[PDB]
Each structure stands twice: as structure tokens, then as C-alpha cells.
């Protein structure tokens, strides 16, 4: 039932968006998170931020000595999100007035 939330709430709720992937570490206690990016009013994209052997996190924008690494992490799209229920009172009044 996440579809009834705005993309902005989903984007500011990193525990929700850790539930968008399952991660298998190559070495014990290697960690990973998804960075979210708004794509439309109804969709987002996510890309992993993953620790290497040196304890540091790398993602699409990582550099060494200022040179982009361009490692090749994926971007995955999630879509279908709607606006939150601010409309309920005006709408059920409209329906009643219409019926009347």
C-alpha cells in the first residue's frame, strides 16, 4: 500500500527504500544503501551505494583524484505513486451536493 504515499515521503524514509532491494555481501559486514532521485510526480529511480574493501562507500558520482570512476552501478525505476488524501472532505461534500 505504498502507492497512496507521495514520492517525497518515500524519498525521505530511507528504511522504506532499503526494502526495495536485497543485498548479498561479498565479504562479511560489507554494506549497501539505495540513493533515491525523483524522476516524475509519480515515479523515482534508485541506485546502490556500496562499500568496497577499504571501508568506503562508492556510487555513480564517486571520484578518486577528481576523476569519475564510472563503476557502473544500476539505476532501477519505481512508479505509480499518487497524491495524499487532502481532498476527502471537499470530495465527499461534492458527491453529497451532486446527489442532492
Amino acid at each position: 500500500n505504498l502507492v497512496d504515499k507521495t514520492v517525497d515521503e518515500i524519498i525521505n524514509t530511507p528504511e522504506i527504500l532499503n526494502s526495495f532491494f536485497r543485498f548479498t555481501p561479498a565479504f562479511e559486514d560489507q554494506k549497501a544503501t539505495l540513493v533515491a532521485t525523483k524522476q516524475s510526480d509519480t515515479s523515482l529511480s534508485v541506485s546502490p551505494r556500496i562499500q568496497f574493501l577499504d571501508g568506503n562507500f562508492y556510487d555513480l558520482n564517486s571520484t578518486i583524484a577528481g576523476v569519475p570512476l564510472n563503476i557502473g552501478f544500476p539505476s532501477r525505476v519505481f512508479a505509480g505513486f499518487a497524491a495524499l488524501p487532502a481532498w476527502v472532505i471537499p470530495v465527499s461534500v461534492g458527491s453529497s451536493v451532486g446527489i442532492l
Binding site: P85, V88, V91, S92, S95, S96, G98, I99
Partner: peptide, 13 residues
């Protein structure tokens, strides 16, 4: 409940 508020008035209409 939220779709019932949409659906009931429509059927009545």
C-alpha cells in the same frame, strides 16, 4: 473506506 466514499455516490447517481 476511501473508495466506498467514491463508489456509493456514483451508484446512487
Amino acid at each position: 473506506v476511501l473508495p466506498l466514499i467514491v463508489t456509493v455516490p456514483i451508484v446512487v447517481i
